[PDB]
Amino acid sequence: QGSQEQGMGMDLYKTSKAAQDVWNRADNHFKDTYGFSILDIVINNPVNLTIHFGGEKGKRIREN
Amino acid sequence: EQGIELEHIDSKSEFAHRIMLTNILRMMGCVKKQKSARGIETRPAQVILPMSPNHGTFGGDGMYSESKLSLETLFNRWHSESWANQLTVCGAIIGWTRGTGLMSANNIIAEGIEKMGVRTFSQKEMAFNLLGLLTPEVVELCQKS
Description:
- The structure is cut from a larger assembly and holds chains A and B.
- By secondary structure, chain A is mainly alpha-helical.
- Helices cover 58% and strands 0% of the residues of chain A.
- In chain B, 47% of the residues lie in helices and 10% in strands.
- The longest helix of chain B has 27 residues, at 11-37.
C-alpha cells in the first residue's frame, strides 16, 4: 500500500492483451459477487458507491 | 373510446392502441436500454400494468380489450428474453372503482352490484390496493417471477 492514484495501471490496460485479461476477469468477478466494477473505481474514483440487492443476481450478491 | 364497435374502429382506436400498448412496450424498452448502457443489473424497475378482467365482455370499447389482453404477453416474455434483470412485471387486475358522484363511472348501479356479494372500492381503497404491490414483500416476489 501507499501510491494509489486514479487511472493506475490503465495505460497498460489500453495496450496489453495480458493486462486486459487480468482486469476484465477481476471486474466481472467483482460485478457478479459484490455488485461493483473495480475498473469504474480505479478510472473514475467516485466519492460514494451504492450496491443494490435487487433481483435474483442481487439476492446472491447480498448473501456474499 | 365509447360506442366504438368493430364496424367503427378507425383512427382514434388505432391511436389509443398505441398509447395503451405499443408505446408502453417502447417505454419499458427504453428503460432497459438506459439501465443496460450503465450496466445496472441489480436494480430492476417494477412495471405495474393496469389489466382488465373484462376482455370483450361489454363492447363499444374500440381496441381497449385488445390493448389490455396483449400486456398478458409480458408475463411470459419476462422468462423468454434478456430484460428480466432490468424490469419486473406486476399486473394489477383493477376492479370496480367508484368515481365522484352519480354520472362518474356507473355509480348508480354500484349499490346493486354489491347486493350480488361483489365488493366495489373508493378510489382511495383502489389506490391502497395498488400501493400494496409496491410494498417490500410483493416487490420481492415480482423479482422471482
